[model samples]
Target: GHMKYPVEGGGNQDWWPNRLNLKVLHQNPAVADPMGAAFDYAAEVATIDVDALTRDIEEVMTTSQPWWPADYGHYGPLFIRMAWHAAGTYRIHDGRGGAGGGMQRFAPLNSWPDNASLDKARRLLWPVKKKYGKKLSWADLIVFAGNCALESMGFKTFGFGFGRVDQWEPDEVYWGKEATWLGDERYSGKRDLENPLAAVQMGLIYVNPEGPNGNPDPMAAAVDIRETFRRMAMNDVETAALIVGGHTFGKTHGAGPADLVGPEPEAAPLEQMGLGWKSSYGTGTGKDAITSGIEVVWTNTPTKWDNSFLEILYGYEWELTKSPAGAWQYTAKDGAGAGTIPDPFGGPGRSPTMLATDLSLRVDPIYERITRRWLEHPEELADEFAKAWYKLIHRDMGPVARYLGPLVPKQTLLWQDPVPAVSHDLVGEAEIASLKSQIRASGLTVSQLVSTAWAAASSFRGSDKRGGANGGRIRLQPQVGWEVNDPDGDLRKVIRTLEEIQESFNSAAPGNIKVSFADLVVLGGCAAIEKAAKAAGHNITVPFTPGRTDASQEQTDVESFAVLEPKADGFRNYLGKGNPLPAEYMLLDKANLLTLSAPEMTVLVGGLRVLGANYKRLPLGVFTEASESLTNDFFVNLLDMGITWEPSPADDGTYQGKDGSGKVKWTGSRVDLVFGSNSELRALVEVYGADDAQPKFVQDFVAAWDKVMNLDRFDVR
Candidate 1:
C-alpha cells in the first residue's frame, strides 16, 4: 500500500499552481554538501601533481573498456566532446550553465540527448579521479582530461586552470519550456532563439548537428550556428575555430537505428549503475554503438590534430545523405578518401563524411571567409583555435584570481573583465574616516549614494562571479548608459561628485594612499548608511573595503556588459518592460543570483524602501515618513492590519494601501506587496514588523548590504 497524501505526490505546487516558489531559497543548501564548510577546493587542488595527473589522463585516453570501446583506439575525441558539452552550456545572458560546477555529473545534463553516450567518457576517467580523491575535483578533472586529450593528439593548448569545485547537486536552470527532448519552443518571429538560451533545441548545447530543427539545410544551419555561438559569446572566427578544431579529432557514431536505443541515464534501469543509452543492436559496444544517430568521420586522421579538417571541408563537394539511423548528414559527392578514413573496429576503411554544421562554414559568407583564411594560414588557425579553446573552458571561471594551478595564463584577456592590481598602499581606518567625511560633504544624499553603490555592485551575479564595484565599471560606457543606472543624469552627477572627491583626496595624500573612484563610490554609501542608521537611533558603522580600481573604456566589452543590465530589480521596485515573469518572481530570481537568503532579502527590502532607494526616486515602496532614515517602517506599514490593499486605478501593475475611510495611504509595486502577500515572505515580514525588531533589522540590513557590496571581491575572498 502507498500513501496518497499531497505532500508525497506533487506537493504544494500541485495544490496551488500560482503559489510563489520559495525553492530558490533552498538551492545549494549546506546540508547537501558532503565536504562541508571546511572544504576548500583551491587549497586541495594546490597539492595536485600536475605532471603525474597529466600522465594519468593521457593513459585514460588510450585505455579502452569492453562495454564502451574507445574510437580510433583513443578516448581523446570522446573526452573532448564531454568537456566541450560541459562548458558549452554557458549562456552569456545569465552565466548559469558551464563546467565550473561539474554539473554534467547530475541529472538533465547527464541524460541530455545532445550529450548522448558521454556517460562512458566520465566513467573512463574514474580511475584517475579515484586515485586523486578529494585533491582532484570532478570539475577540474573533466576539463583537464580534455586538455590532456588535445595535447596527446598533437595539439598544444594555451593553458589550463584547475580550481573548479564539484557541485553536489544540479543547478535550477531554465533549459526550455518544451516537455519533449529536442523540441524547441524558444524561437519567435525572425528566428531569435530567445534571451538566456543558447541552444536551438531543448537539450542541445548549441545547434543541432544535422541542421536547424533537423531540416538539413546547410545555409539555415549556418544561421542557427551563428546565433547560438554568439549567444555563447563566441565571434564568427572563434566559432569557426571551435567547430573546425573540434571536429578534426572525432567520428560520429550511428551504426544502428536510433529508436532501438534504450532509455537515457535518468530513465535507465537501476542495474545499469548510471550508464545509459543501451543499444540492443548486434554487438552494440563498438561498431554498432549509436550516439548522435549520424555516423561519419569528418577527417581522415581522426585521432590526431591537423589541417585536414579545413582541407577536406574545402577540397570536396558534399551531398545530402542519411545515416543508417535515419538522421540527415552529408558525404563527399566524389567519394573522396573512400578508404582513407579508418574504421573504429578495425573493419574496412569508410568513406569521408561531413555534418550539415560542418558544411555551414563552407557556405556562410562570414564563416566561409574565416575558414578560408584559416585554411590558407594553417598556423594562424592553430593559434586562434588554441586561444579560443582556452577561452571556452575558462570563461565561466571568472577572474584570474579564482583560477588555481600552475598553468593559469600570464596574459590577462579583456574577456576576463581584468582589473589592474593595486600598486599603492590601501587606506587605513584614519584615511577611510577622512574620505567618508569628504564624501558626506560632497552633497550626495543617502538615496543617491546608496542607489549608485547598489547600481554598481548589484550587477554581480554569483552564477559566474562577474560584474561588481571592483572595476568601477558603472562609470564606463555601457553601464553608464544602462536604463537602471539613472540614464537621465542623476547618477552622472553622483559620479562627478565622487570623482572630484577622489581626485582631491589623492592629490594631497601621503605616499601610496590614493583613493579610486570605485572606493569613493562605495565609501560614500557606507558614510550615508552610517548617518541614516544614526538618524534612526542606531549607531552602526557599515564596513567598507577599499581596493577597487577603475577600468577604462578600452578594458570593457560594451556588447558583453550590456547583457548585465537589470531588467527588473525588486530591491529598487523597478520593473522593466517585457518582463517574462511577475515582478515578485523577478525579484526572487534577482535575490537568488545575488545569493541572498530569504531573511536577508526581507531585511534589505525593508531597509532600502525606508531609505528612499527606489528607482527614479519613486514613492511606490517608500512606506516611511522619515524616508532617509534606516527604519523597519516598510515592513511595519506593509503588515499593518488597518490598511486594506487593492489594485490601483492606474492599472499599471501596482496596488494601493488605503486607510479605513478609503483614503490612499501608500502606493506599492508587486515587489513591495509580495512581502506581505506571500505567506512565507509575510512570515518574515511579521518578524521585522514587530515593535522590538528595529535594531535587528538594521543589523541584518547592514550585513546584507556588505555582502552585496563585496560580492565581486574575489581577490579578497
Candidate 2:
C-alpha cells in the first residue's frame, strides 16, 4: 500500500488544497517531516484534454487572434492565472463550500462576477473541467494546478485537501453585502486586484460566454491599476503591503492601462463617459496601440506570496469612472501629476521606468529593528513586546499574518508540545462496506445506520449511580462534551434521553446518575479540540506534557497518563468559562469531525462538553463507561478486536434454524447483531450519505444489516 506523505498535518488525498490538511496526530520534531510521499496516483493528477483545452481557447481566441491561430497554447499561463483567481472568490460573509466545490459560483443568484475572463484572466485548462466527472471536483483541480505549477516552475510546495464537493449554486463566493460595499467603481475608483474577491470571480468562473447562457463577461471587476494598492490597503493594511512581496520571483507582463479603459484619448472620462476611440495600456510601449500591447510585468517569484503587489511599482495609466448607464469605464492615468486622462483607444503604450528604487536594496525599519534586537543583542533588548511592535510595523504584517494568525497571546506560549496520538484506522473501509452492503440488501435505508448508532449510544446507559456504598456518587459518562446548560432538571433530561435509548435496545440499564466523567466528556473522541482554533482563525497544535501518570502528588499511584490530558482539560476549562480557546490552537484538520469543521457544532452536540486531551485520541464506544475507561493499549486492542469480529454472531448465539418456517436462517443472535445499529455502526456514513440527501439508502443499509448479522447467511440476504 502506498502511503501519502503528510508534511503539513493530515493526509491530503489528491483532491483538495493542502492548507486545510491539519495534523491530527503529532509527529516527532526530531525527524524531518515527509514532504512528498512516493505514492503513485493511478492517473497523472488529471486526464486534461490538452487538445480540448486548446480547442476551448481556440474558439474564444479566434474572436481576438488571427483566423484561428494554431498556438492558442501561448495563452496557457494567463488562463491558469484566471482559474486561480476564480477559485479565490470566497469571502467570510457566506460559508465556504466543502460540498459543492467551485460550482457555487455559476448560478444566476449572486451578482458576484465569476464568469468572465477578458480583463482579469482566462484559462485554456477548462477542458479538464468539462471532461472530469461532476463527482470529481473543480476545487480539487484548481488546487492541483497550483501544486503542479509550483513543481513545474521549480518552486516550493503548496498544500492540498482532496475532499471538497461540487455544489450546485452560488455558495462560498466570500463576498457578502458587507464586502460589496468595500469597493465600488463609483467610490474608491478601482477594484482590489490582490484580494480574494478578484481571485474568485476570475479563477473559478473564468469565462461567462453568451449564446443561450451569457459569455464575453469579465473574470472579475476591472481594476484602476493606479488605485489597486490604495484600495487593498483600506481593508487589511498589513495584507496589502505583504502582497507587494510577490515581486521577489516570476515574471509579469502588463494588461496595459489602455487595454482596460479605451483607445480614444478621453474616451472613458473620470465618471465613465466615453469619447470616441479603441483602447491601449501602460506607458507608451506600443506608440499608438495604447491598450493592446500591455506588459505582464510580474516576472517575479511565485514561491513567495509577495509578487502580486510588485506590478504597482511599474506605474499605471488607467482611470476607472462610472459611465452614464451606471457602468464603469476605463481611461488613461491622468498626466500633469493629477488624474489619468490619456486617449485609451488610440495612444502608444507607455515605456515605463525601472522599479520604484530597487526592491532588493530597500531597508524596512521594522525588519532592521527586529533583526538588530534578536541576533545582535538579545540580552540588551529585555522587552520582547517592543521587539514584536517594531516587527509588526515594518516587516509587513500581511505576509506574516498569513502564516501566524495571532497564534496565542504569548501568555501560554510555554505550554508543552503535545503528545502524539495514533489514529486507530479502526473503522476499516472493507468491513464497513461489507456491513453496508448487507444492510442495503435487507431493504433498509442508510440513515438507519446512524439511527442504530444513536440507538446503541442511547441503549448503553452508565448510571452516575455508581453505588454510594463508599459514598461513590452514582455516575454517568457521556460522549465527550455535553454542555448541559439546561435551565431546569438538566441531568434528568440526559437521563431521559439515555433511558429511551436503553428501552429501544430492550436493555434494563438504569439511567439514574450523580457523578459525571466530566473529564472524558471534554476530550472529544471524534471532534478533536483543534476545531476551536479554526473559527478564531488561528492554527494551534496542542502541546505535550511530561509524566505518564495522572497529575497527582500520590507518587505510588502511577497510571500511564497521556501528555495531552492536562492541555485537553485546560481547553475544556476555557470553554466552560465562555472564553474562546486561544487562536494558536486553531488547527485545520479536515477529517475526524472534531478537527474537521467548526467547534461550535461540537459544543452544540455536547451540552456539558469540553475539549479533551492534548492529543488526537478517541473515546471508548458509546457503550463504554468512564469507570471502565480503557487505557492506551487496552483501548487500541479492543478496537482491533472489534475490527476482526465476524459480521454475523455476537457473544452468545447458535445458528439454529428458523422456527417451523423451515428457513435455515441462523436462530443465533449477536449482542451487536440483535441491536441492528450497533453491529454496523461504522457503516453509518457511506450507506446513509449526508442527512440532507436521500434517506432511502439508510433504510436499505439497515435492512441489509439484519441479513448480514444473521450467522446463517454468508452473503447479504
Candidate 3:
C-alpha cells in the first residue's frame, strides 16, 4: 500500500494520436434529415461532447441496426468503454483519489483488480479519447460521459461525483503484480482460504437476496445464511458447488475478480453469441444485468478510494455466506441454479424476512461500517465487529439490491512476488527486434525502422523479462518462493540478447525498462501492468466489453478472438524485445489493405461479416470445420493475399467451397498472420474453396464510398 510503483510507458507522455480519424464517410445526406443543429453542451470534446455523443448514438441507431436490411454493430461500445476507464479509476487506497480523469495512465489503477472486464471497455472507449485530446484526463469527463451514454439510451440517475484531477498519472504510476495479491500469479483469481471468510461472507449477502425467486410469505421463516453455507461446504469440491456458487457471482452473475476473465458477457464477440442485428440486450434472462451491477460494486466500483475496508467486507462475505435451501445447486445434471436462489416462499421455506431488503440492508450496513471504521480510525474509534454488523443490516443497502439472481465472478488473489529480474540489455534488444519483425511479417511492406519505433511503444505491453529462480518470471513472476535466480532455457535466449542491449544503453540510451528489477516488484506489478496496458490497446475496435460479451451467451475453445496484445509482447520480450505498436498499430487502418503471409505464418483472413440472425469469422470458427476431398476450383496463394469476398452468409462461399467429401481446408492454411487482432482481418489470408472446375467468386461492393462493406461483426468468443 505504501510502495513506489514502477514507471513503464504511460502518463500523458505515452499516448500518441489515433491513426484513423474517420468522418462518417458514408452519411447519406441524401436520405437526409434536418440539418444538424444545437451544440447543446460545451467545449466540444468528442470524448465528452454530449451532442456529438448523441449524434453518434442516433446514427448507429439508424445504420447499425442489427435487424435492418443493411446494418452493423454501431461503434457505440467504444464510447461506453471510454466512459468506464475514465470513471473506473477511483482507488480509495490513494489519498489523491476522486473522479479525476487520466486513470488510463494511472499505475495499478488502470490494471486494478476491479478492472478485468475493462479491457474491451477501454478499447471501445479509446476512439473518443483519440478523437478528443481536449479531454485527456477522461476520468473527470467520464462520469458526465456515462450519464450521456445512459441518457442517450433512455435511462437516468446514474450516480457520481467528479473532483478527479490528474494527480500522479496512471501511466507514470504502474501496477505490476498487485493482481497477484488477489490470486495465483499465473491466472487472475484462483481463490484459496487465506481469509477463508471472504467468499463465505460474499455468499451470505448473495443469498440474502432470495435468489431470483422471492418468498410469497411475508412472515414465513427464512434460510439461515450460516447454516446454509456450512451445509454447502460439506460437499467439499465434489459438489463443485463452491466453484459453482463462486462462479455464479463471477462467471454467471459478475461479482469479483473472477468475472473479468472473458469479455464482458454482456458485450461478447458477435460470433460467439448470435451475431445478427440484436439489441445490446440481445441475450436476456435479465439476470446478467444484475450480475454486471454486482460486479461493478464488489470489484471495481465499490467505494473506490483506497478500499481500506474492501477486503474486509469481501472477507466478511466469505466468512458468513450461506443459502437457506443449502449451498446453491449448479446446473449439473439438474439446471444450474443461482447462488441467490431462495427456497420456495413460506415460513417453512422462504419468508419475506429472509428476502426483506430494507431489513437486511439495515442490519448489514451498521455492522460493516462499525468494524471497518474502528479498524481504520483506531485513534478516534472503538473496536466492534458487532456494531459493524448492525450497521450493515440497518443502513442503506446501497447498490446491493441492483444485483439480483445472476451473479458474476470477480477474482482476487493473495499477492506474492512477481517475475524476478532480467538481462536489461539483451531483453531490450529483443524487444526492438520483435517490433521490426512484426512489421515485416505484416506484409504491408512498411519500413522496418518505423515498425520498430511503434513496437518500441509496446514496451508498455511486454512483461518484465527477469533473471530469477525457475527460469525467470514473466509479468506475474508466477513461480513461487524464489528471489534472484538466473535466466535459462527459453528465457536465457531472451536475456542473452538483453545483455547486449544493456551494454548498448550504457552508451546510447534511455534504458529499455525504467525501473530496476527490485523497484518493479515493490511497485506492485507496475512494469508488467504497463506492457499489458499497452497490449490492451490494440483490442479497442471490438466488443471486448463486459456487457457486450455477456450478451453473446456463447463460449469458445481457445482464448477466442485472440487478444494479440499478449502474444505481441511475448514475442517482444522473448524475441526482439522491442515494442509492437508502430509497426503493427500504425500500418493498417481500415483503408490500409495489409499483405502479410509469412512462410512460417500459416494465415487466413476472412472478414467477419454480420449477417441476419447470425455472423461469423471465416474458417475454423462459426463456419463448419475442415472436410476431406479437395476440389479443382479451390483457392490458393495468389487469390488469398487480397480479401475480396463480401458474400452474404446466405450466399455461401463456405457452402459452395466444399466438395462431395465436404472438404474445406482453407482455414489451416490461413489462421491469419497479419492485420487485425483475433478473428479480425481474416480476409488477408487464403482459404480453399470447392476444387470444382468453376467455383463462384465474390462480387458486390454496395458501400464503396464508405469503404467497409455492410458488415456488423457483432460477436466472437
Candidate 4:
C-alpha cells in the first residue's frame, strides 16, 4: 500500500502528547490575511463617511427583519449586549481577549452561551458592514454599531475610535481547562478564578446571569460580580455604572422552553449560515425568542435611555423566581408596576424582572453606595457610564497613537497609559554615535546592558499591545520593582548609569537636541551587542531609532503594570518557581507574545546565550569560553554529537550534557536543550551551528535584536 501522508491522520499530538507545539506561536501569519500585502485598513478608514455610516447603523437598528425580529421594533439593546460581550472578554492579567480582533465573529466566542443570539445582532449590522466594506473592519463596525445604538436611544456616548484591524483566525487563548460548557473547574479556595480568565464559567462572558453556578443567592452573586468585573479592569464606580447602565435597556429572552433552542453557531448545521440557537416555539422569533434562558424586562422604558432602571430597582422589593424556561431570576413582589413594560409582539404588558446578578448591585454595600450616589446625580452617572463604556471597548487597543479616525478623544485617559509627546528634537547619527560611546564606557558588562534592555522591552505583550521600551516606564515603579528585572539592585545600577549619560549628553548638546532614558536603554543594548560581535571578529552595527520618552511614576498605573511582570522569560533562561508548563513551552509562549517567528526566536536565544545574557548572569547556558562574544557557540555546543544529556540529580527542571565518558561538560535548562532535542528546532540549530554560519548568525542576531528593541515604537510606525 502507498504510504499515507502525515497530515492524513493523527498528527504529532497522537504520539507525543507532551511535545511543545511551536505551531501555536505562528498564528495569523500574513498568508492567512485575506486583505493581502497591499491592503491598508487605516488609509481606507480615513476615506470613510463617518456620519453616513452612523446613520446607516441607526437605520438598521430600527428596521425589523423576519428571520430575527427586534424587540419593540428596536435592535439597540441587542447591539449593546453584542458590543458589551465583545469587549468584556478582555482581562488585565495577560492582556488577551477584547474586541480588537473582531474575535466575536469566530468559533468559541460566536457559539458562547452568553453570546446566544448575538449572531443575529451581527447579521442585523451586515447591511452597514457591507456598505462600508474594507473601509470599516468587523472589529470597528461591531463597537461603532453599539455606539450608534446607544445614540439612537437618546444616550450620549464617549466618542469612538476606528483603527481595530481584523484577525483572519481565532487567537490561541487558554479560555479554561474545562471540557464542556458551563464548567467551573477554574476556581480554587474562596472563589478565586484563575489568572487571565475574566469569565466565571466556560462559554460565559462575565458571570452566570442566573447567579454564580445557577445559584439564586444575591449575596454570593454580588461577590462573583465584583471579582469578575475587577478582573476585567473595572473599579467600583465603573462596575456599578456598567451593570446599571447596561440593564437600562433591553429585555432578556426565554418566552418558551429552553429545550426548544437548537445548537450554538459553531455546532449548528450548514443550512443556518453562521446563525444558531434557532427556537421552535411560536413564530421562532420576536416574543417567542429564547436567550439566556431567564426572561426578564429590567425597566418600563426598555427601549429608551433613562434612570428608570435604578429608580425601579430601588423602588420595589424583588423576590426569588424562575423564568418560563425554569432558569433562576428575580421579580418585583406583589406585581409592582405591572403592565408598564411594552410588548414587542403586540402582547399585553408584563411586570418588571431582574437576574440574580442585577440585585447584587443593590445588596453589595459598596455597589449599593455607588448606585445611590448615581441616583442622586443622574447626570454624573450618565457621564461616568459613557467614560467607562469607552474604556471597555478601547482598553485592548493599546496606545492612543494606534487610534485612528476623527472621533478619537482629545483628552487622553490614564488607562490608556498616556506618554508625553516628544517636545525635543530626536537624536541624529552624530548624537547617537556620541551616546553609544558614552554607554560603552559606562563599565557595565555586556550581559548587564543587554539583559536590562531586554527586561524593559520584553514586557510588551502583542495581545494587548501594552508595555515595551517606550515611555521609560522600566525606570518607574512596578517595572523597577519586578523580580525579573533584578528589582532595585542590578537594574538600579543600569538605570543610574544610563540617566547620567542622558543628562550629560542633553545638557551639552546643540539647541533642541536631547535624549531620553528610554532611548538610552535600547541604545545601550545595541552598543553592547556591537561590542560583543566585534569580540567575535564580526564588526557590525545594531539598528537604533530613538524617539521614546520617559514616563513618570504618576503617569504609570502600578497595579495594572504589575500584571505584566514576567513569571518566566525563556530567552533570558529565567523561569520563576511554580510555573505549571514546561520551560520550553513557556519559551515558546513568551516568543509568541513578543510576536517572534521561529528563526527570530532561535537567533536571539543563541546570540543572547553566547553574550552571557542569562538571568542573574547564570552559567547554565553559556557554552563558550568567551561568553562576552556574540558567536554561534550556543548552537554549536548544543548540537555536538559526542555529548548526551540526562536529567540533573538536583531535581530542578535542568539537564546535564555529559561527555562520552559520563563526565559533565555543560549544564542547561529545558529552554536551552530544546533547540537540539526538538526536530524542527534542531534543524534551525544545525543551520547556525555549521562551521561557515558565523557571519550569518551574527547578522541574523542583530536584526532580531533590533526588532525587539523597536517593537513598541508605535509613534514612529
lDDT of 2 by residue, 1-717 (tens): 444556633354454442222233221221342323442221333343433433444344223332111111233333334333433332211113221144423432122233222222212335556665442355444434433443333333322223333333333223322344123222222422333232212322211111001211222211221122222211222222222322223222333443353423222254422222233333322222222222223332223333222333324443333222222332225542232212222333332221211221122333333323333443322243223222222111111111111111232110111111222222233332332233334332222222222211221111100000010011222222133211133333433433333233223212421111111111111112223323323333222111111111221111211101112121111122322232112211111212121222122112111112211212212222222111122112222322323332443322232324444322212211222222222233222233342234223322322211121111111
Ranking by TM-score: 1, 4, 2, 3
State which candidate has the highest TM-score. 1
Better of 1 and 3 by lDDT: 1
Can you tell me which runs of candidate 3 are displaced by over 4 Å? 1-208, 211-488, 507-717
Error of 3 at 159 (Å): 16
506-590 per-residue lDDT for model 1 (tens digits): 8889887888888888888889999899998998999998899888889998888877889999999889997778999999999
Judged by whole-model lDDT over C-alpha atoms, candidate 1 comes out at 0.89
Model 4 lDDT on a 0 to 1 scale: 0.88
Sort all candidates by lDDT, best to worst.
Answer: 1, 4, 2, 3
Taken over the whole model, the C-alpha lDDT of each candidate is 0.89, 0.26, 0.25, 0.88
**Candidate 2: which stretches are off by over 4 Å?**
1-80, 91-94, 97-100, 104-123, 130-136, 172-174, 178-296, 300-717
Q: Write model 3 residue lDDT over 117-179, tens digit each, in one string.
A: 333333344445565444433544444444344334332221322223233323322122223
List all candidate RMSDs to the true structure.
1.5, 21.7, 22.3, 1.9
Quote the positional error of residue 660 for candidate 1 in Å. 2.2
Per-residue error (Å), model 3, residue 80? 18
